[PDB]
Structure formats: C-alpha cells, structure tokens
Structure 1
C-alpha cells in the first residue's frame, strides 16, 4: 500500500489457415518496439515526381512466459506466418474503474529468436521470444486496433 503498483497484460499468438492456437498467454517482459527511419537510398531522382513515403518503419515485439500448448504442439509434432491478437484493459483515471479493453491485431507475424541462451547457471524457464511484424505488398498490414469503454 506504500509504493509499487503493477498491472496485467496478455498475449495471444495464432496460426493462419486453422483455428489452432500455438503459443503462450501472459507477457512478462512484454517488450514492444516500433520505430521509423530513412536514409539516402533515394539520394537522387529525375525530379518532377512527388514522393514514395518509404520511412522504412519496423515492429519489434517480445513475450516471455512460455507454456505454448500441448494439443497443438503435439499436432505440429508429427508457413502461414501467423497472426497476433493483443488484449489490454484500460481504466478511467478519474474513477479508476475498469471500463475499456484494447484489441491489437497484426495480421502477419515472424518468429525469429537468438537460439542460444546457453546460460552458465540454469534459469527458471521463461524463454523470451522476439517478434518482427511481417508484411506483404497488398494492403493494410501492421495493425488494426479496437477499443472498449462504450459506457
């Protein structure tokens, strides 16, 4: 009651082309990073055009609790690029009441981890796992977000 405060999150990871759900739920570190940039890649053009708005852009995500699954892990035991739903709750600061929940949806996912902890002293499981937001050429990609609190 003195000084601390914590909150909660949740991570859902899913596989395209099937109702399978092969992953965890509860991001301990839950680190998410998004950034934009540019360079001199277009350092020279024929002029009289307009733009391309490259911006590079990138989406880096992470989760760490493990316990992926047993049924679907066994089913895969014997390359849709996967998709993500992120659910978070938001409360009104004036009243501190639970009224809004957040949906986060990245249609394309990419599993790419540094496949060697090799830690000199054994850990308590928790294999942190990082995430790169994949994307095709067609349309949208990245995310669409939904919001609760329709009170």
Structure 2
C-alpha cells in the first residue's frame, strides 16, 4: 500500500490477407527501442545536390506470450504480415480516473527470432519474442495511433 505501483498493457497481433485472430495477453518487459542514426551516405557531387532526407528509422518490438492459439496452431501442426496492434491506457494525474485509451498499430511487422535461448536451468517458460519493423516501398505504414480521450 506504499509504492509497489505498476500498470498493464495489451498486445494484439494479426495475420494479413484473412481474419486470423492472434494476440498476447500481457507484456511484462515490453522493451520498445527506437533508433535514429547515420554515418555517411553522400558522395557530394553535382554542384547543387538540392536534396537530402536520409534518416535511419527503425522500430523494435518485444513481447512475452504464453497464449498462442490452438484454433489454428493444432491445424498447422497436423506466412503473413503478422501486423501488430498494441493496446494500452493512460491516466490523468490530476484525477487518476479511467478516461483515456491509447492504441498503437503496425501494419507491416516481420518477426526476427533468434534461435539461441540455450540455458541450463528450466525457466518459467517466458518465451520472449522480439520483432523488427518492416516497411514497403509505396508509402505510410510504420505506426498508427487512435486517441480515445474525448470529453
């Protein structure tokens, strides 16, 4: 009743081209990493270059799930734009009331899993999943948000 405070989050997945329902109940770690950097990508010729807009834009996703779905998992036992739709909530410190919901959506996510969880002792499962943000050539994609704090 002192300061062991903490919140929760929702993680929703989806497979494109059909209405497949895949989601994650809870994400404890939920380490979100965003990187912008550059080293050198300009020759420097043509007198007036007239343009430069390079910016390395990567979005990293990480969830831990114990709920895959057998509805399809069993059928597949005997890909798609895993596209991800994060869900969470926000609170106002002045009132501390449930009034706002925050959605985060990614329409093109390709999982980049590492096959090296080599460890001696048996853990509490905890199959941490890490994702990479993939983009097409056309336009848009990356992240989309919806605000639900209307009053």
Offset of residue 23 of structure 1: 4.1
Pairs within 5 Å for 1:2-151: 2-151=2-151
34-43 or 129-138, which deviates more: 34-43
Structure 1 counterpart SS, 2:20: coil
**Number of equivalences:** 151
Q: Which runs of 5+ in 1 are unaligned?
A: none
**Retained in 2: the 8 A contact 1:28–1:65?**
no
**Retained in 2: the 8 A contact 1:64–1:129?**
yes
Q: Aligned equivalents of 1:10 and 1:118: distance in 2?
A: 28
**Retained in 1: the 8 A contact 2:26–2:64?**
yes
Offset of residue 25 of structure 1: 2.5
Flag the 1:134–1:2 CA change in 2: closer, same or farther, 3 A: same
Which structure has more strand as a fraction of its residues?
Answer: 2
TM-score, scaled relative to structure 1: 0.92
Q: Which runs of 5+ in 2 are unaligned?
A: none
Flag the 1:44–1:76 CA change in 2: closer, same or farther, 3 A: farther
TM-score, scaled relative to structure 2: 0.92
Offset of residue 78 of structure 1: 4.2
